[PDB]
């Protein structure tokens, strides 16, 4: 279901919709979430009303949480970019009492308004982070900001740098990740100088988050292009050797080692394209990557954001 | 193989039952049995719990006779609740949470009868107004470390969100058994009816507080306001004649007029406002 | 073989309903509670427990 | 307000750690070592923190 | 009272000093805890 | 949230705790106490207690493990 | 011949037996099937807790009847 | 093998004070209960019986149990007064036969009528077809100052089990004062 | 006889569970069970319960089935694990008391002659408490019978024990009023009182219309007490009352005056301290 | 088998101590089963008080491997 | 009136019932025609699980309605 959903994404081919429907209805805790994800992939951006009404039904009433924890992505992914047209869905999801659907609403409002800082989107998304009772949705809320801000990196430090001091660690991890994902392509001189104390926070997994964000923001910088590359190099090199530092921290260091030298240095992220348009496959890849918190083998989806960094000449079609 | 994501769901009713039973046997280690269902290989629900009769050794307890539970496990099915048993619990008062060297033995046979079994432990005297100290454990076979493997092959972050206490880790813990995360199953209806706790009769809201004692209370409070006001200006004059570093010490032995004054203003205003509003509402709503 | 002994001490006073201040036979003093079943009317100061 | 709340939350974990004795110093020795006396015990030869 | 309280918070500024207990003491505490738990 | 965290710190005041005598205060939130075991300690104090009741020779309670004023 | 037993997990077990089989022989067969120490397991039928020396015959048991098995339980 | 559960219904109306039979009527019906309960016990030991009684209003003296001693001692306590209330008796028996421990048991009513009753045909047919949907089996003993000519009871067995189904049977009064329990000894088995 | 009853919350959660648990088994409108508790002086304290199988058919008011020996031996089982509790009553969850109920009581009265009936409403829509308590009495009247048998009202309240209160307080994470104090002293009170009184008067009118017509089985006692109620209302307009009311409020205001003055001067001192603590420190950065 | 079990409790190092007392106490008025301790009540024999060489005093709700009939202060 | 029961095996069995029928009796028919004992099933109906003390009318089920059925293995 993973392979087929990826390879046929966005086609809205009917046969795969059929087969994934019948695979979900089994109500099994290891099939139904993968079917949900694959369905989201193939149904990409269709805003298909009957399919949505179909797939919300099972999610309204099931015993197994895994399926909900999968479909929470799919019901956002089907809804890409329609902006206010999706509002009717939003006004339902944020009304739900089940925490997983409230969590999904965040991803949905994020994916509906990508690249545009619509005032009501930022207002509601920021509001819910301050006031919800469940920490996972409080994370996902601030996590969503990066998608709706990324066209104006100079803005985010004006807001995330306050919330980075939240007492509870979930909000700190969320804000650090939102910053790291939003500006990720540019070695911004300001944002980086927030992350050093985060790299020394007593909570281990927020340090993991901070290391990931740091290694992401810098992907092709050099010591002349920003004055910090060697610092983070040697930080990774020490913490990966240290025999006493925590697991679920140095895991982040290993991933940093990989990402910073990914693809022979010949690659970078492209969530903004040089034509001025947004580039869906990198958006999907990075969103699915952020879910590694729940299920490790999704990390491969990060590869969908890599793009070559070259110029090539041609004289004839051959 | 086992994993690092398994999740235990407990209802409110099991919680209140366990707290009450554990607190009643406060000097000793009481016992009980818990029942529910394995909805899947990743999650387990416990729905209800019932106590058990014991003869107590000084250190611990043993279940006196099994005829009791053999009766109970069919006595109640005449009224629904057909669930099978899934685990047991005992309470450590103030010690902390761990499995003793014999609790482990008792868990051995529970697991041998069903490999998914669980053990639960609670602390009824350290738990206060929140943060009720509950934990869940399961044994691990030393065979796996003889191979040099480790249990609980891992695929997810969500198991590592908490750290064990030093006291729990001095005892066996990871070298003998491993913990499982817990969460609370709820529904809106029971919440909607539980919050009625300390609601009160409507009539209580419309009482006039015995107009003869009210003035006595008022012009009792005013007297100590007098005697404090005459002691305030000394501490105002001494504001700066000494090193401020020791000024904290100037508080410690001797009550200060400023902080101790304003609580009387709080009392007086809070009383005299509502006493006056209620009289107006009465003098309008009746005739 | 499973029995366990108990310390002997002397009651000094009662603080609240379930907290009492007691003295051991060697010097130390403690604040501690009691079983719910004992007749707390008997525990006048100076009794041995 | 956030800083004071965080400090209050951390106070519980901070307060759990162990205490410290009080002693009377007799006279100092070479290389940052002194001699101290604790009243219900014998005298010790101890070293000095960097501050 | 409201008039006085309104202008009280203007002078408090430049309070960026925000430290809890330490930076490197956590490693020492963890090492001591591990050493105590070993024995 | 601060009200909950304010009343969450009373786990420390559990049932078995020793009794000592207050001697003096070196500064804020730190003091010298003498346990009835027979030795003197230099220890920490808890924040929420009232600082106007620490008289020269009053009687206080200490944590059984940490020997911290409670 | 053959006999059944059930237990509080909902598990059932089936034993080839003969009426001459002693209760201790039954316990032995149970351990041979599942490994439980014979002293932690206890048996009940007809409201009566079993003892070792009697036999299926003198227990008046008949084909395919179902015993109850229950476990010893202590803290410590 | 069939597993059985039976509610036995007993009359103690005023007319039960009659003694036209050789012993007091109470003794005859008591020994009838004895024989039927023993027969059901030996039929299968896991079968169980419960005791219910008719008067001006019905009563239950034991819930369904495999024991006999309680039934015997309670019936020893019984004393006859008041009218009879057959319809209510059957309806409450229908309630008590539910809430059953042995759901897989088939259900049996045994009934004695020692007195006349002003029952209504239409109500009894409604009840009877209801119970036929319930697929309950009734057996009834007419005796003493009988139901005249079995007149309603016949239609009862007609409307209930007893037509298109041999689950339910009417035994006429053995008119001779000899012990009816000895005389019904075949009809309960040749039901 | 008995002056008030205090109910612990554990029975509330147990009943709420039982209702849905039976909802599995059948189309039953109602459920019934046994209440266990203890006595002090004239006050009853009730703390634990278990359900008993029960059946009823709306075919008629006189065909219902309660099982004896289930209760008989279940109480034995509970006795054998806690000796302090005695059977002390029974409960059911009908929205209002039913016609059968008195004849139900005459059954179980054999187990305790003081037995009391408690109603627990499982579906709240309203701001009254969910409980009610009723005790049986005979009452004499001129004619129609020497005595009727009648349920009459005993006052009831919810309480909590030391540790069950901790348990419940752990669960209510999701809502609290912002601050206890004068705003709680009002909004948690006066508005609720006024709403309750309005609902009571509404029910009075609803009965009075169905007595002006409808079935109208006129009952004179109602009219007697209503005459008392209407006679009781005071004349506020009397001059000698007005002079007293002014002479009281015109005194009460002085204390608010004085207190507000003190509050203002303390806040002023606090401002002075802040400003001088700033101007003498800001200069240090040159 | 049980005999050798006893043999292993004895082992060897033993504190020495003096018998201070010999005492005789009777059960509570109510002694439910449930949670109840089979030691602080419901032994018909004596109970004792001892003084260790380390100057501690302990109550003993049961004496152990020695018959009280031959102990004296 | 007709309803269809799609088993996990893919086999769909024709069940004749009425709105006055009850889920316990549909389970009875299931045990009758497929042998499977009545506690070994869960009835899913592409939504919430069915409950046995309820009539078919309570679920608004109508002619030719289709449902899927899953086993309920317990223990091991």
Neighbours of chain B (3+ CB pairs under 8 A): A, C, E, F, G, I, J, K
Q: Are F19 and B217 in contact (CB under 8 A)?
A: no
Give the separation between CA F49 and CA G71, rounded to whole angstroms.
51
F12 at D interface, C-beta within 8 A:
yes
Longest dimension (CA), chain K: 38
> Would the CB atoms of I81 and J30 count as touching at under 8 Å?
no
Alpha carbons within 13 angstroms on the beta-carbon side of residue B15 total 28
> Would the CB atoms of J30 and I82 count as touching at under 8 Å?
no
State the count of interchain CB pairs (< 8 A) between B and I.
Answer: 173
Give the separation between CA G1 and CA G65, rounded to whole angstroms.
11
State the count of interchain CB pairs (< 8 A) between B and F.
Answer: 33
Q: How far is F30 from chain B (nearest CA, A)?
A: 11
Longest dimension (CA), chain C: 37
> Would the CB atoms of B114 and G9 count as touching at under 8 Å?
yes
B186-204 in b/e form (b: 16+ CB < 10 A) is eeeebeebbebeeeeebee
Give me the resolution in angstroms, 1 decimal. 3.6
Provide the 10 A C-beta neighbour count for residue H190.
Answer: 9
> Would the CB atoms of F14 and B255 count as touching at under 8 Å?
no
> Would the CB atoms of F8 and B253 count as touching at under 8 Å?
no
**Using CB atoms within 10 A of its CB, is residue I267 exposed (0-12), middle (13-18) or buried (19+)?**
middle
Give the separation between CA I89 and CA I46, rounded to whole angstroms.
9
Residues of E with CB under 8 A from a CB of D: 18, 20-21, 29
Provide the 10 A C-beta neighbour count for residue F60.
Answer: 18
**Vertex B13 angle, CA I101 and B31, to 5°:** 115
Structural domain spans, chain H: 3-186
Mutate to test the interface with D, among F2, F10, F20 (most CBs of D within 10 A): F2
Provide the Cα torsion I192, I196, I201, I203; round to 10°.
140
F51 at B interface, C-beta within 8 A:
yes
* Residue recorded with tokens 């000519």: H149
Give the separation between CA C13 and CA A215, rounded to whole angstroms.
65
> Would the CB atoms of J38 and B56 count as touching at under 8 Å?
yes
Give the separation between CA A137 and CA A108, rounded to whole angstroms.
13
D31 at F interface, C-beta within 8 A:
no
E36 at B interface, C-beta within 8 A:
yes
DSSP designation for K55: B
> Would the CB atoms of B114 and K75 count as touching at under 8 Å?
yes
D11 at A interface, C-beta within 8 A:
no
Give the separation between CA A165 and CA D2, rounded to whole angstroms.
8
Give the separation between CA D48 and CA D44, rounded to whole angstroms.
13
In chain B, positions 108-147, which contact chain K (CB-CB < 8 Å)? 114-115
E1 at B interface, C-beta within 8 A:
no
Q: Which of B69, B105, B110 sits opposite G70 (nearest CB)?
A: B69
> Would the CB atoms of B270 and I182 count as touching at under 8 Å?
yes
3-state secondary structure of A47: coil
Q: How far is B8 from chain G (nearest CA, A)?
A: 18
HEC string of I54-96? EEECCCCCCCEEECHHHHHHHHHHHHCCCCCCEEEEEEECCCC
C31 at J interface, C-beta within 8 A:
no
Nearest C-alpha in B relative to E32: B166
> Would the CB atoms of B170 and E37 count as touching at under 8 Å?
yes
Q: Are I31 and I54 in contact (CB under 8 A)?
A: yes
Give the separation between CA I93 and CA I18, rounded to whole angstroms.
10
Do G and A count as touching (3 or more CB pairs closer than 8 A)? no
Instruction: Please choose, from the candidates K27, B75, K38, H105, the residue with its C-alpha nearest in 3D space to the C-alpha of residue H97.
Output: H105
Q: Would you give the distance in Å from CA A240 to the centre of its chain? A: 25
Show the tokens assigned to B277.
Answer: 């509003």
Neighbours of chain H (3+ CB pairs under 8 A): I
Known binding-site residues of B for Zn(2+) equal: 90, 92, 103
H6: Cβ–Cβ under 8 A, 6 or more apart, which residues?
H36, H40, H47, H48, H49, H50, H107, H108, H109, H110
DSSP designation for I277: H
Q: Which of E18, E23, E30 sits opposite A200 (nearest CB)?
A: E23
DSSP designation for F61: E
Q: Which of D1, D11, D40 sits opposite F38 (nearest CB)?
A: D40
State the count of interchain CB pairs (< 8 A) between H and I.
Answer: 31
Neighbours of chain I (3+ CB pairs under 8 A): B, E, H, J, K
Where are the alpha helices (H) located in B4-139, listed in sequence order?
12-24, 67-75, 103-113
D29: Cβ–Cβ under 8 A, 6 or more apart, which residues?
D35, D45
Q: Are K43 and K23 in contact (CB under 8 A)?
A: yes
- Chain B residues touching residue I193 (CB < 8 angstroms): 202-206
Where are the alpha helices (H) located in A64-168, listed in sequence order?
65-77, 87-93, 99-112, 119-131, 135-143, 145-149, 157-163
Instruction: Please choose, from the candidates A18, B174, B215, B55, the residue with its C-alpha nearest in 3D space to the C-alpha of residue J31.
Output: B55
> Would the CB atoms of J49 and C8 count as touching at under 8 Å?
yes
Show the tokens assigned to J7.
Answer: 């043999």
Structural domain spans, chain I: 2-182, 223-282
Residue I150 has φ and ψ, to the nearest 5°, of -145, 135
Q: How was this structure determined?
A: cryo-EM
Q: How far is A68 from chain K (nearest CA, A)?
A: 14
- Chain H residues touching residue I59 (CB < 8 angstroms): 91
Detail the DSSP E strand segments found in B2-70. Answer: 7-10, 31-40, 43-51, 54-56, 61-63
Do D and F count as touching (3 or more CB pairs closer than 8 A)? yes
Long-range CB pairs of I65-71, under 8 A, 24+ apart, other chains included: I65/H60, I65/H92, I65/H95, I65/H96, I65/H99, I66/I32, I66/I104, I66/I107, I67/H63, I67/H99, I68/H60, I68/H62, I68/H63, I69/H62, I69/H63, I69/H65, I70/B75, I70/B78, I70/H63, I71/I34, I71/I108, I71/I111
Q: How far is K55 from chain I (nearest CA, A)?
A: 9
Q: Which of C2, C33, C36 sits opposite B57 (nearest CB)?
A: C2
Show the tokens assigned to G52.
Answer: 């070792």
Neighbours of chain J (3+ CB pairs under 8 A): B, C, I
Known binding-site residues of B equal: 90, 92, 103
DSSP designation for A29: T
- Chain B residues touching residue E33 (CB < 8 angstroms): 166
Where are the alpha helices (H) located in F1-70, listed in sequence order?
2-7
Show the tokens assigned to B226.
Answer: 């007098």
Mutate to test the interface with K, among I26, I28, I55 (most CBs of K within 10 A): I26
Give the separation between CA F8 and CA F12, rounded to whole angstroms.
9
* Residue recorded with tokens 């319930």: H134
- By DSSP bridging, strand B43-51 and strand B31-40 are antiparallel
3-state secondary structure of H71: helix
Give the separation between CA K73 and CA K76, rounded to whole angstroms.
8
Give the total residue count for chain K: 76
K70 at A interface, C-beta within 8 A:
yes
Provide the 10 A C-beta neighbour count for residue I45.
Answer: 16
Show the tokens assigned to B252.
Answer: 């410690």
Q: How far is B258 from chain I (nearest CA, A)?
A: 8
- Chain K residues touching residue I27 (CB < 8 angstroms): 53-55
Q: Are I82 and J30 in contact (CB under 8 A)?
A: no
> Would the CB atoms of I53 and H99 count as touching at under 8 Å?
yes
Give the separation between CA H150 and CA H152, rounded to whole angstroms.
6
- Chain B residues touching residue G34 (CB < 8 angstroms): 112-113
């Amino acid at each position: 279901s993973l392979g087929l959903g990826l390879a046929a994404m966005g086609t809205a081919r009917q046969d795969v919709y059929d087969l994934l429907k019948t695979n979900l209805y089994q109500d099994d805790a290891v099939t139904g979430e993968a079917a949900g994800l694959a369905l989201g992939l193939v149904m990409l951006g269709s805003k298909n009303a009957q399919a949505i009404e179909d797939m919300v039904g099972y999610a309204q009433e099931t015993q197994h949480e895994k399926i909900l924890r999968g479909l929470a992505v799919g019901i956002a992914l089907v809804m890409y970019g329609r902006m206010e047209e999706a509002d009717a869905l939003i006004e339902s999801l944020c009304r739900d009492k089940d925490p997983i659907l409230r969590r999904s609403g965040m991803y949905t409002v994020a994916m509906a308004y990508c690249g545009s800082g619509n005032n009501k989107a930022i207002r509601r998304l920021l509001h819910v982070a301050v006031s919800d009772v469940n920490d996972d949705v409080r994370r996902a809320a601030v996590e969503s900001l990066g998608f709706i801000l990324f066209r104006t990196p100079e803005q985010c430090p004006s807001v995330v740098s306050l919330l980075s001091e939240s007492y509870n660690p979930h909000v700190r991890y969320g804000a650090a990740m939102a910053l790291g994902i939003c500006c990720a392509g540019t070695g911004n001189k300001e944002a980086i100088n927030l992350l050093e104390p985060m790299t020394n926070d007593p909570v281990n997994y927020v340090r993991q988050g901070a290391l990931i964000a740091s290694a992401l923001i810098m992907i092709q910088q050099t010591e002349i292009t920003c004055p910090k590359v060697n610092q983070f190099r040697q930080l990774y090199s020490k913490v990966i050797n240290d025999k006493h530092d925590d697991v679920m921290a140095k895991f982040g260091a290993i991933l940093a080692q990989g990402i910073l030298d990914a693809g022979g240095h010949n690659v970078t992220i492209s969530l903004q394209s040089r034509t001025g348009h947004t580039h869906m496959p990198s958006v999907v890849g990075v969103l699915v990557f952020t879910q590694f918190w729940f299920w490790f083998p999704l990390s491969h989806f990060l590869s969908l954001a890599y793009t070559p960094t070259c110029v090539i000449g041609l004289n004839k079609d051959l | 193989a086992v994993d690092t994501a398994e999740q235990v769901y407990i209802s409110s009713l099991a919680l209140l039952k366990m707290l009450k039973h554990g607190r009643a046997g406060v000097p000793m280690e009481v016992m009980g049995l818990m029942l529910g269902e394995f909805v899947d290989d990743y999650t387990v629900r416990v729905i209800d719990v019932f106590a058990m009769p014991q003869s107590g050794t000084g250190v611990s307890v043993e279940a006196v006779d099994p005829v009791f539970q053999a009766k109970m496990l069919d006595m109640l099915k005449q009224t629904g609740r057909p669930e099978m048993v899934v685990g047991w619990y005992h309470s450590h008062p103030g010690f902390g949470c761990w499995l003793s060297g014999v609790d482990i033995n008792t868990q051995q046979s529970f697991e041998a009868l069903s490999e998914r079994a669980v053990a639960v432990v609670v602390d009824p005297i350290q738990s206060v107004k929140g943060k009720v100290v509950i934990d869940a454990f399961r044994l691990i076979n030393a065979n796996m470390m003889v191979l040099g493997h480790e249990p609980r092959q891992t695929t997810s972050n969500l198991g590592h969100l908490n750290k064990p206490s030093i006291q729990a880790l001095i005892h066996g813990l990871n070298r003998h058994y491993y913990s499982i995360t817990i969460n609370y199953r709820k529904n809106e209806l029971e919440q909607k009816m539980l919050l009625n706790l300390h609601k009160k009769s409507w009539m209580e809201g419309l009482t006039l507080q015995d107009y003869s004692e009210h003035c006595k209370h008022n012009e009792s409070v005013v007297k100590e306001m007098l005697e404090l006001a005459k002691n305030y200006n000394k501490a105002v004059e001494e504001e700066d004649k000494m090193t401020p570093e020791q000024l904290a010490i100037k508080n410690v032995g001797k009550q200060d007029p400023k902080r101790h004054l304003e609580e009387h203003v709080d009392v007086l205003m809070t009383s005299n406002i509502v006493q006056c509003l209620a009289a107006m509402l009465d003098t309008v709503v009746f005739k | 073989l499973q029995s366990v002994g108990q310390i002997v001490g002397e009651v000094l006073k009662q603080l609240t309903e379930e907290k009492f201040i007691v003295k051991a036979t060697n010097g130390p003093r403690y604040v501690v509670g009691c079983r719910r079943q004992l007749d707390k009317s008997k525990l006048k100061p100076g009794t041995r427990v | 307000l956030n800083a004071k709340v965080r400090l209050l939350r951390e106070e519980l974990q901070l307060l759990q750690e162990q205490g410290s004795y009080v002693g009377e110093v007799v006279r100092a020795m070479d290389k940052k070592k002194v001699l101290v006396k604790v009243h219900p015990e014998g005298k010790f030869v101890v070293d000095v923190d960097k501050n | 009272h409201n008039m006085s309280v309104k202008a009280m918070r203007f002078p408090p500024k430049s309070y960026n000093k925000d430290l809890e207990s330490a930076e490197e003491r956590r490693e020492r505490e963890q090492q001591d805890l591990e050493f105590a738990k070993e024995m | 949230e601060f009200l909950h965290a304010q009343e969450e710190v009373k786990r420390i005041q559990s049932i078995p705790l020793v009794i000592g005598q207050f001697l003096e205060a070196v500064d804020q939130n730190t003091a010298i106490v003498g346990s009835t075991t027979g030795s003197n300690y230099y220890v920490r104090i808890l924040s929420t207690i009232d600082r106007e009741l620490l008289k020269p020779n009053a009687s206080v309670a200490l944590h059984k493990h940490s020997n911290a004023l409670v | 011949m053959q006999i059944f037993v059930k237990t509080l997990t909902g598990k059932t077990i089936t034993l080839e037996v003969e009426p001459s089989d002693t209760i201790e022989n039954v316990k032995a067969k149970i351990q041979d099937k599942e490994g439980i120490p014979p002293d932690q397991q206890r048996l009940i039928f007809a409201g009566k807790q079993l003892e070792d020396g009697r036999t299926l015959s003198d227990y008046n048991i008949q084909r395919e009847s179902t015993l109850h098995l229950v476990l010893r339980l202590r803290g410590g | 093998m069939v597993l059985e559960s039976t509610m036995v219904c007993v009359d103690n109306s005023e007319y039960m004070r009659n003694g036209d039979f050789l012993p007091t009527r109470l003794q005859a019906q008591q020994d009838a209960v004895n024989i039927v309960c023993h027969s059901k016990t030996r039929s299968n030991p896991e079968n169980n019986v419960g005791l219910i009684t008719l008067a001006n209003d019905c009563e239950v003296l034991t819930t369904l149990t495999p024991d006999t001693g309680r039934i015997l001692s309670k019936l020893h306590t019984v004393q006859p007064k008041g009218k009879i209330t057959f319809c209510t008796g059957i309806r409450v028996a229908h309630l008590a036969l539910k809430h059953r421990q042995g759901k897989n048991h088939k259900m049996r009513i045994i009934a004695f009528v020692g007195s006349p009753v002003e029952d209504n045909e239409k109500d009894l047919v409604k009840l009877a077809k209801r119970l036929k949907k319930e697929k309950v089996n009734v057996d009834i003993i007419n005796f003493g100052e009988e139901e005249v000519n079995t007149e309603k009871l016949t239609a009862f067995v007609n409307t209930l089990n007893g037509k298109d189904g041999t689950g339910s049977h009417l035994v006429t009064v053995p008119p001779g004062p000899s012990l009816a329990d000895a005389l019904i000894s075949s009809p309960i088995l040749a039901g | 006889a008995v002056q008030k009853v205090v109910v612990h919350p554990l029975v509330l959660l147990s009943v709420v569970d039982h209702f849905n648990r039976i909802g599995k088994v059948g189309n039953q409108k109602r459920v019934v069970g046994v209440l266990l508790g203890s006595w002090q002086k004239k006050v009853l304290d009730v703390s634990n319960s278990f359900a008993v199988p029960f059946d009823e058919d709306d075919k008629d008011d006189s065909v219902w089935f309660l099982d004896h020996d289930y209760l008989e031996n279940m109480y034995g089982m509970f006795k054998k694990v806690n000796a302090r509790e005695r059977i002390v009553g029974w409960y059911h969850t009908g929205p209002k008391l039913h016609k059968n109920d008195i004849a139900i009581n005459e059954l179980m009265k054999r187990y305790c002659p003081n037995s009391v009936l408690v109603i627990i409403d499982v579906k709240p829509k309203d701001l009254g408490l969910p409980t009610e308590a009723y005790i049986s009495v005979e009452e004499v009247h001129d004619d129609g019978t020497p005595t009727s048998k009648t349920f009459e009202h005993v006052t009831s309240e919810i309480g909590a024990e030391e540790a069950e209160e901790v348990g419940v307080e752990h669960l209510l994470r999701d809502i609290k009023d912002t601050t206890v104090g004068t705003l709680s002293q009002r909004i948690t009170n006066q508005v609720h009182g006024l709403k309750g009184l309005n609902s009571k008067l509404l029910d009075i009118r609803s009965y009075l219309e169905k007595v002006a017509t409808g079935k109208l089985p006129i009952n004179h006692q109602i009219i007697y007490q209503l005459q008392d109620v209407f006679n009781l209302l005071p004349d506020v307009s009397l001059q000698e009352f007005v002079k007293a009311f002014y002479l009281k409020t015109n005194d009460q205001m002085v204390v608010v005056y004085l207190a507000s003055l003190i509050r203002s001067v303390v806040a002023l001192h606090n401002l002075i301290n802040n400003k001088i603590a700033n101007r003498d420190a800001e200069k240090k950065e040159g | 088998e049980n005999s050798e079990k006893i043999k292993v409790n004895k082992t060897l190092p033993y504190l020495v101590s003096n018998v201070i007392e010999l005492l005789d106490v009777d059960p509570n008025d109510q002694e439910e089963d449930g949670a109840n301790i089979d030691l602080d009540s419901q032994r018909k024999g004596k109970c004792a008080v001892i003084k260790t060489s380390t100057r501690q005093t302990y109550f003993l709700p049961v004496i152990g491997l020695v018959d009280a009939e031959k102990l004296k202060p």
